[PDB]
A paper describes a structure:
The virion possesses a short non-contractile tail extending approximately 44 nm from an icosahedral capsid.
The icosahedral reconstruction of the capsid, which was determined to a resolution of 3.01 Å, has an outer diameter of approximately 88 nm. The capsid has a triangulation number (T) of nine, with an asymmetric unit comprising nine copies of the major capsid protein (MCP) gp32, nine copies of the capsid auxiliary protein gp36, one copy of the trimeric head fibre protein (HFT) gp21, and two copies of the dimeric head fibre protein (HFD) gp29. The MCP adopts the HK97-like fold—the canonical fold of the capsid proteins of the viruses in the class Caudovirecetes14, with the main body comprising the A-domain and P-domain. This insertion domain forms a three-fold symmetric assembly with the auxiliary protein at the capsid surface, making up much of the exposed surface of the capsid and contributing substantially to the capsid wall thickness and stability. Winged hexons span the edges of the icosahedron, on both sides of the icosahedral two-fold symmetry axes, whereas planar hexons are positioned at the three-fold symmetry axes. At the centre of each hexon is a pocket formed by the MCP and auxiliary protein, which serves as a binding site for fibre proteins. A trimer of the head fibre protein gp21 (residues 1–38) binds in the planar hexon pocket at the three-fold symmetric site, whereas a dimer of the capsid fibre protein gp29 (residues 1–58) binds in the winged hexon.
Numbering used by the authors:
A (entry chain g), D (entry chain h), G (entry chain i): 1 to 333
B (entry chain F): 2 to 51
C (entry chain H): 52 to 504
E (entry chain I): 102 to 202
F (entry chain F): 455 to 504
The structure:
C-alpha cells in the first residue's frame, strides 16, 4: 500500500521485549530506552543486520500516543440476509423468474464508476417451499459467483436452517442440491470476500456490493420479491496483510527505495511482519522545533507493532515498559 | 570469490554442458517483452465532466 | 588535503540516484577435490596405500560437475598422475562423483596425500581411439558481477544581527582573516561582513572536503540507514576515499621492514604487473621516509660481499671551510630501492601525511603515525580514473537568506518580503557530492596498527 | 545457482510425509504414489498454490536412486596448523622479523590468477618464548584478516594451549594480549570462512590459501622459520544454502525463469526451504525411451530434500515409503 | 559507550561545535559523533549530546572518551527530504608583544 | 525555503523558512444568485431527505 | 574570553541573599522576585551604582535551569608517569643516552601546527640503578623546563618513592642529587601548569604535552626505554580566574561594550567577582515568544554566580528561594 505521511512515518516490529541493550540477539527484539530525566525516548531494535535505534523523541514535543487494538484494524465483512417479503408472498409464486441482481461498485478499477453485475436466477414451481427456493437460489448464485472460472472472489453465499440459526451452511459451485438435506432454510446470506493480496503491489481492497431484486407478477402487479437487510458481520479480515504493506512502505524510509527495481542490482530488505498473524499497534506522533527562528515544526510519526494472543499481552508489557521509562501514561488496551 | 563491495549482490557464476532457458534466466538473459502497441483502457461511462 | 582532492578528476552526473557498474573478471579455473573413494566406495584416508596400483578404477568427488566423460584431468602433480573419466558424473546431491582410472603407464597408483580434500584439478584433453570412437568432452561458461555507490549532502549557516550591515571596526588590534593553510593574516578591511563572508565560504569548502575524503557510511547490510535527521528522515551518509579504498590491499603493521614491503610489492607484481610496469611510487610522510632509509640501510649493511666506496657513494664529501684545509661533510639518505625482476620502489612525500591537526595519534617513534604510512594509489594503468569526485550536473549547491528588515550579507536595507520581525539575517547554503573507488584492489596501503580501533 | 544437468532436474521439498493424496493440506507435504503392479512412481507434493504431481518414473527405466546425508554436503573448513620448525630453532630469534604470508586464490574474481596476499609480522626479542610469539603472531594476523574494514571474511584465526589441545580460542582485531593469559601456546590454526550467500545471485564459494613463510637469518643462513601442517577439519558449512540455490534453480524448470526480470511485472515464486536448516537428499536418476524408432534416452533426475535432526529421520521414512511403493531397494542414511 | 546508536554526552570547556556537525576524536573516521541538540551551558563548559554516525553498533571504548582527547570538525550532513538548518562558523584574534629600554 | 519546484527557483534572497520544502496557496471567491425560487419546481424522493 | 551566545547571555553576581527589595544595601546583594501566580520571574541585584533588575522570565518559557558546582569547572592538571619498561630492561644499560623528549602541542600560536619540543638527557653508567636514573633524569628535565628563562611555565617535575607511593617530592632546577636522598624512586610524573591570566586580555588556557622517547641500543636493537601513562590527576585550577572573564564579557551586554579603548574617555565598569575565589553557577535558559505572527523565539540566558566555599551553602539557599518563588524544581547541589 501507499499511505499519507505527516512528513514521515517509521515502523518498528516488537517481536520480543527485552530489558537491556545486551539482550538484543534475535531480529525482532526491542527495548524502550529513556533516561531518568524523562527528556528523550528512543527504541533499540534488533534488525536482520545488527542493532538499530529510532530517531529520538523529545518527550515535551509529543502530540499524541495511542495504542490501537487488532480488532479495530480488521475489516468487517458486510453481509446481507436475503429473504422473500411476506407482503408479496410468503412462498414462491410458480412460473415467475425470481431473479436476483448483485451489484459490485469497486470492481477491477478503484472508482465507483467501475461497476459489475452478476445474477442469480430461479424459476419457481408448484409445491415449492421457501427452503427449496433458497436452496435453488444459493446454488444458482454460487455457480455464477463462486465458480472456478471467475477471475476474482466476489461473495460467500450461505444458508441457515432455522433449527440452527447460528451456523451458516456454506455453498459453492461444487455444492449440489443433495448436499443440503434441511427443510427450514430461511435466508440467503451474501458476504463480501477477502480479495487477493501480494506484498507491496496489491493493496488490501474490497469490492462492496448491494443485492438488487427484480419484479414478479403476483396478483396482476409487478412487485419486488425479496428484501435485503444488512446484519451484524461475523467474519473479520485480520491486519496481517495490512501491517505487512505498512512495513514494506515504512522500511524504505530507513532503507532502500529502489525495491527490486533493477532486479539483480538491488538491496533485498528483510521484513519481520508475518502476514498470517494479528498485530496490535502503537503510534506516537511528535515533532522537532529549532532555535529562535526555525520555530516551524517537523511532525514525525513512529509506530510499533506486536502480535496479539487475544489478550494483547505483548503490547501491554511493551507500553508498560515505555511508561516506566518515559513517564507517559498510554492506556493498556 | 568474495564480496568486494558492501552491497555487492551478484557472484561469479559458472556451469558446464547443456544449458537451459532456466540457465539463461538465472544469469538474467531472459526478460518479458512489453507490448507497447497494446493497452487496455478500462471501460465506463465517465460522468465527471457533467 | 585540497591538493590531494585535486589530484583526482570529476565526473558530472545527472541525478542523486545510486549508480552501479559492471565488474568483469577472470575465467581459468581449478576445481577443488572433496574426497576420493576406493573401488569399493570406501573413503581414501591420508595414511593409506596407493589406489590405482594397477589400472584399477576409483572415484573422485567434486563440488560441481565441471568435468566431462572421457576427459583426462590432473591433480597438483600434473603430467605424472593423469586421471581419465570412465563415464559421466553420478551426482550425489550437489556433489559430483566420477569414475576414474589412471592413464600414462602408471602401475603403482597414486599416493593418498595426492587425493585429499582441497587438491586442485584441471582438464588436460580428451584422448580417443582412431577406429570406432564415440563422443567425448564438453565446454563451459561463466558470468560477470557488479557493484554500487551512493551520495551525500551537507548544510551550513551563520546568523548575524542586522546592525552588521556597514559596521566599521576600530582596529584596536589588527583584524585577521583565517586562511585555509591555518595561517592568520593581517587584513585592512574595516567591515565585519568581509570576514563573515570569508569564513562561511572557508568552512563550507572545509565541509565538502572532509566529506569527499573522510566520508564514512551509516548504512546497514539490511540496506537501512540508522542516523535519522531532524525531519525524521534518514541521513544518507556515503563513504569516502579512504574508507572506500581501505577495504582491499591494506596491512596493519607493528613493525616496518623492507622484506615485508618488497614481498608484498613483488608477490603483487608477479601476479598482476608485467615486468616493465613494476615501478611503485609510494606516498607517505617524512617520518616514513626516514624509516625507509633505516631499513634500506641495514639490508645494505648485510651486503658483506661488496665494499661500498665513498668515491661512488660520496657518503662523506669535501667542503670548503676555514677551520681546516681538508674539511669533510658527512651524510646520506636512502630514498629508493630496486628489488629483483623489474621492481622499482620510489617515494613521493606529501605534507598531507604529516598534518598534526587532522592526525592526533602519535607514533612512539617520534611523530604522527599517519606519516609512518605508505600508500600506492595507482598500482597499474586503468584507461580510467579509479578514483574521482562525483558532481550532479546542475544540483550542486544552493544559497539562501532568510532575513528581516536589513540584510547584512547582501547589504539590502529594506525587505519587501520579510521572514520574521527581527533585525537579523541568516545565510543557508547546501551542496551535494559523492566519491567513487571502482577497484579498491588497485590501492595498496601499509598502515600502523596503532592507527585502527 | 547455475549447475550442470542431464537434460533436466527437478526438486521437491518433503517438509512432512503423509499417507494419502487427501492429507496434503499444508505446503511442502508430499507422498510417493506407485501402482500396486509397481510400473510407475510419482510424488504428490502440496504446493503453496495447491497441489502437484512429479513426472512419472518408469521403474524399469531407473538408472540410480541414492540418498545423500547432510554431513556429505557440509563443506569441511580447511585448517592449517602453524608452528616453529625446531630444526632452525625451537624458539624465536631475538632480532629477526618473523613475517607470514597467506596467499589467497579465487579472490573476488573466479580464477586462480586472482591472487591476494595478507601478512603478519612479529619482530622477536630476547626473553621471548614460543607462547608469546604465537600470541603476537595471532594478533598481527587478526588485525589484518579478522578486522571490520575488510570486505571479505578471509580466515578465522585461533590459538591452542597445550593444556587444552582440543579447545581453540578465537582472535579478532579487537582481541588484546591481556585477554590471552595462558603461557603454553603451541600452534596457530587458520581456517576458511563461510562467505556471503545470496539466493540465486551469490553461490556458496570459498577462498583457499597456503601459509607461505619467509626466511630468517639464524646462523648467517636464510632458513624458513615455520611449517604449515594441515590438520583434521573441525568446523563445517551446512548445506542449507546449497539446497536453497538448488531449489531456486530447479523451480525455474517447472516454473518461472523471469524470476525478477522486469520487476513489477513478475511472477513471484514461493520457495519452501529454510537456508538455516540442514537437509538430507535423495536423487533418483531415470530416463524415458520411446517406441520403435525413438529409442534414444531422455535422461532425467528429481531431487527430494527433507530436513535432518542429527539422526537421519524424515528420510528413512520417506525412503521406506518409496521402497514399499515402488519395490526399489534404497539405502537408508 | 554508544551501543546501538545510543546517545551520550560529551562535555567540553568551550562552545565550539554546532548542532548537526560530525566531530571525530583521535581515531578519526572510526568513531564519528553527530552533535544532535545545541550545546547546554554548564557554566562555561559546554555539554553536547551525540550519536555515533559510522554504522557503529558496539559503541566507543571508555578509553577514547577520557580527558584530553582532541576533537575536530568534519562536516554537517543532512537528509535530502525536509532538511533544517545545521552548521556554523568561527573567528579568532591575534596578540602583541612589548619591549623596553 | 531554499528552492521551489513549482517555479524551478534554486535560491531565494527572501526565504520563508529554513526547511527544504515549498508550499503553494490558492484562494478564490464565488457566488450564485436565484432571483425567484418559485420558478423552479423539484420533485424529489423522500429518501434523499424529507 | 569571548564566549558564544544564544542571542545573549547575562550574568548577575550574588554576594548576599535578601528577602525584599528594601534590604538591598550592599552591592552584589540579590533577591528573586515572582508574583504569587508564578507567571514571571526576575532578579533585583544591587549594582555598585544602585538597584537594578534582571530581564523578566516567562516561567512557562523556561527551557533549562541547572546549577553547576565549583568542582565541575576546575581544570584538572593532567599528569603522566614515566618509567623504565621492564621488557627492554628494568635497569639502566650502561653507556646509553636516555634522551627524553616532551612535545608540546598548543604552544604560543593557539593551534596544533604550533609545536615546541623540550628535552632531557642522561647517560647511564654501570652501577646506575633505576632510582639514580629517575632523579638524574628529573634534574635534567627540571633544568631544561623549570627555567625561569622560559617565557612560559610548561611543566612540573615530581618524583615518587615506593615507600610513600603518593607523596610526590618536587624537583626544581634548584634541587640537586644531594637533596634527593631516597634510594627507592619509581617514576617521574609530569603535571601541566597553570599559565598567566589577565581578564579581557589573556584567557585561561593550557599547553598539552606527551613525553615521547628516543631509542637506545640494548642487543643491537633500537628500543625505547620508557612508557608514559596518564595517571589520575590530583590538582585542579579553581574557577575564579574563569568566572571573572565570564562576567567581564557578560557585563558588556548590560553596559559598556568599550571596556577601555579610548582610555581616559571611558565608562569604567566595577566588577564584583573576586578572581581569586571559587563560585558555583546557575544558568536559566528561556525565550521570548511574541503574538499572532511573531512566534519566532528569542532565547536568553540568566547566569548567576554565588561564592560557594566548602559546602555549596549560598547557591543552595538561592535555589530554595527561586523554587519557592517561581514554583520551579531546580536541583540543589
Amino acid at each position: 500500500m501507499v499511505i499519507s505521511i505527516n512528513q514521515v512515518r517509521q515502523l518498528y516490529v516488537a517481536k520480543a521485549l527485552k530489558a537491556n541493550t545486551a539482550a538484543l540477539t534475535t531480529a525482532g527484539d526491542i527495548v524502550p530506552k529513556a533516561d531518568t530525566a524523562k527528556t528523550t525516548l528512543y527504541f533499540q531494535s534488533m534488525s536482520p543486520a545488527g542493532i538499530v535505534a529510532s530517531d529520538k523523541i523529545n518527550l515535551k514535543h509529543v502530540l499524541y500516543a495511542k495504542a490501537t487494538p487488532s480488532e479495530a484494524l480488521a475489516h468487517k465483512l458486510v453481509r446481507y440476509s436475503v429473504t422473500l417479503d411476506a407482503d408479496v408472498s410468503a412462498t414462491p409464486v410458480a412460473g415467475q423468474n425470481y431473479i436476483l441482481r448483485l451489484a459490485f461498485r469497486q470492481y477491477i478499477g478503484l472508482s465507483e464508476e467501475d461497476q459489475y453485475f452478476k445474477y442469480g436466477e430461479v424459476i419457481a414451481r408448484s409445491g415449492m417451499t421457501a427452503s427449496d427456493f433458497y436452496k435453488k437460489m444459493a446454488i444458482s448464485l454460487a455457480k455464477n459467483l463462486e465458480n472456478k472460472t471467475e477471475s476474482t472472489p466476489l461473495v460467500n453465499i450461505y444458508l441457515i436452517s432455522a433449527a440452527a440459526a447460528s451456523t451458516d451452511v456454506p455453498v459453492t459451485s461444487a455444492t449440489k442440491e443433495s448436499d443440503l438435506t434441511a427443510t427450514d432454510y430461511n435466508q440467503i446470506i451474501i458476504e463480501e470476500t477477502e480479495q487477493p493480496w501480494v506484498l507491496g503491489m496489491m493493496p488490501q481492497a474490497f469490492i462492496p456490493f448491494t443485492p438488487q431484486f427484480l419484479t414478479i407478477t403476483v396478483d396482476g402487479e409487478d412487485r419486488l420479491w425479496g428484501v435485503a437487510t444488512v446484519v451484524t458481520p461475523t467474519k473479520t479480515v485480520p491486519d496481517g496483510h495490512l501491517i505487512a504493506d505498512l512495513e514494506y512502505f515504512c522500511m524504505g524510509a530507513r532503507g532502500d527505495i529502489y525495491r527490486g527495481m533493477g532486479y539483480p542490482n538491488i538491496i533485498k530488505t528483510t521484513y519481520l511482519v508475518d502476514p498470517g498473524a494479528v498485530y496490535d499497534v502503537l503510534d506516537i506522533h511528535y515533532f522537532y522545533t529549532g532555535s529562535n527562528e526555525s520555530v516551524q515544526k517537523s511532525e514525525k510519526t513512529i509506530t510499533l507493532v506486536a502480535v496479539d494472543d487475544g489478550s494483547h499481552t505483548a503490547m501491554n508489557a511493551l507500553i508498560g515498559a515505555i511508561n516506566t521509562a518515559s513517564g507517559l501514561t498510554i492506556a493498556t488496551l | 570469490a568474495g564480496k568486494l563491495g558492501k552491497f555487492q549482490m551478484l557472484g561469479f557464476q559458472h556451469w558446464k554442458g547443456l544449458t537451459s532457458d532456466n540457465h539463461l534466466g538465472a544469469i538474467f538473459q531472459q526478460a518479458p517483452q512489453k507490448a507497447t502497441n497494446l493497452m487496455v483502457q478500462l471501460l465506463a461511462f465517465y460522468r465527471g465532466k457533467s | 588535503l585540497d591538493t590531494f582532492l585535486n589530484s583526482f578528476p570529476t565526473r558530472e552526473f545527472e541525478d542523486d540516484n545510486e549508480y552501479y557498474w559492471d565488474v568483469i573478471g577472470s575465467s581459468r579455473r581449478n576445481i577443488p577435490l572433496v574426497e576420493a573413494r576406493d573401488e569399493n566406495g570406501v573413503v581414501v584416508a591420508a595414511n593409506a596405500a596407493n589406489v590405482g596400483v594397477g589400472t584399477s578404477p576409483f572415484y573422485l568427488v567434486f563440488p560441481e560437475d565441471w568435468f566431462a566423460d572421457g576427459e583426462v584431468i590432473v591433480g597438483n602433480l600434473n603430467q605424472v598422475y593423469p586421471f581419465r573419466i570412465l563415464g559421466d558424473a553420478r551426482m550425489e546431491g550437489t556433489n559430483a562423483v566420477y569414475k576414474v582410472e589412471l592413464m600414462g603407464g602408471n602401475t603403482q597408483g597414486v599416493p593418498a596425500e595426492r587425493l585429499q580434500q582441497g587438491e586442485r584439478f584441471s582438464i588436460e584433453f580428451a584422448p580417443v581411439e582412431k577406429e570406432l570412437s564415440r563422443k567425448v568432452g564438453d565446454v563451459r561458461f561463466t558470468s560477470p558481477v557488479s557493484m554500487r555507490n551512493e551520495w551525500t549532502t551537507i548544510r551550513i549557516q551563520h546568523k548575524v544581527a542586522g546592525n552588521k550591515l556597514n559596521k566599521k571596526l576600530a582596529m584596536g588590534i589588527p583584524m585577521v582573516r583565517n586562511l585555509e593553510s591555518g595561517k592568520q593574516v593581517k587584513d585592512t578591511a574595516n567591515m565585519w561582513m568581509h570576514y563573515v563572508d570569508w569564513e562561511v565560504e572557508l568552512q563550507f569548502d572545509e565541509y565538502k572536503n572532509n566529506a569527499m575524503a573522510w566520508g564514512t557510511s551509516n548504512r546497514n547490510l539490511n540496506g537501512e540507514y540508522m542516523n535519522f535527521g531532524k525531519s525524521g528522515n534518514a541521513i544518507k551518509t556515503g563513504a569516502g576515499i579512504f574508507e572506500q579504498t581501505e577495504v582491499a590491499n591494506t596491512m596493519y603493521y607493528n613493525t616496518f621492514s623492507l622484506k615485508l614491503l618488497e614481498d608484498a610489492l613483488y608477490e603483487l607484481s608477479a601476479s598482476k604487473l608485467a615486468m616493465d610496469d613494476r615501478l611503485f611510487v609510494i606516498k607517505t610522510g617524512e617520518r616514513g621516509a626516514i624509516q625507509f632509509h633505516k631499513e634500506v640501510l641495514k639490508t645494505v649493511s648485510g651486503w658483506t660481499t661488496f665494499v661500498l666506496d665513498n668515491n661512488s657513494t660520496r657518503v662523506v664529501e669535501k667542503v670548503q671551510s676555514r677551520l681546516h684545509s681538508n674539511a669533510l661533510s658527512a651524510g646520506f639518505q636512502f630514498v629508493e630501492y630496486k628489488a629483483p625482476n623489474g621492481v622499482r620502489v620510489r617515494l613521493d612525500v606529501d605534507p598531507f601525511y604529516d598534518d598534526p591537526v587532522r592526525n592526533k595519534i602519535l607514533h612512539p617513534m617520534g611523530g604522527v603515525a599517519f606519516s609512518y604510512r605508505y600508500d600506492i594509489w595507482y598500482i597499474g594503468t586503468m584507461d580510467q580514473p579509479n578514483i574521482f569526485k562525483c558532481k550532479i550536473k546542475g544540483d550542486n549547491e544552493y544559497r539562501g537568506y532568510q532575513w528581516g528588515i536589513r540584510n547584512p550579507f547582501t547589504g539590502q536595507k529594506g525587505n519587501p518580503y520579510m521572514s520574521f520581525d527581527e533585525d537579523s539575517a541568516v545565510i543557508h547554503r547546501m551542496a551535494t557530492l559523492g566519491v567513487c573507488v571502482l577497484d579498491p584492489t588497485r590501492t595498496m596501503s601499509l598502515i600502523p596498527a596503532i592507527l585502527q580501533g
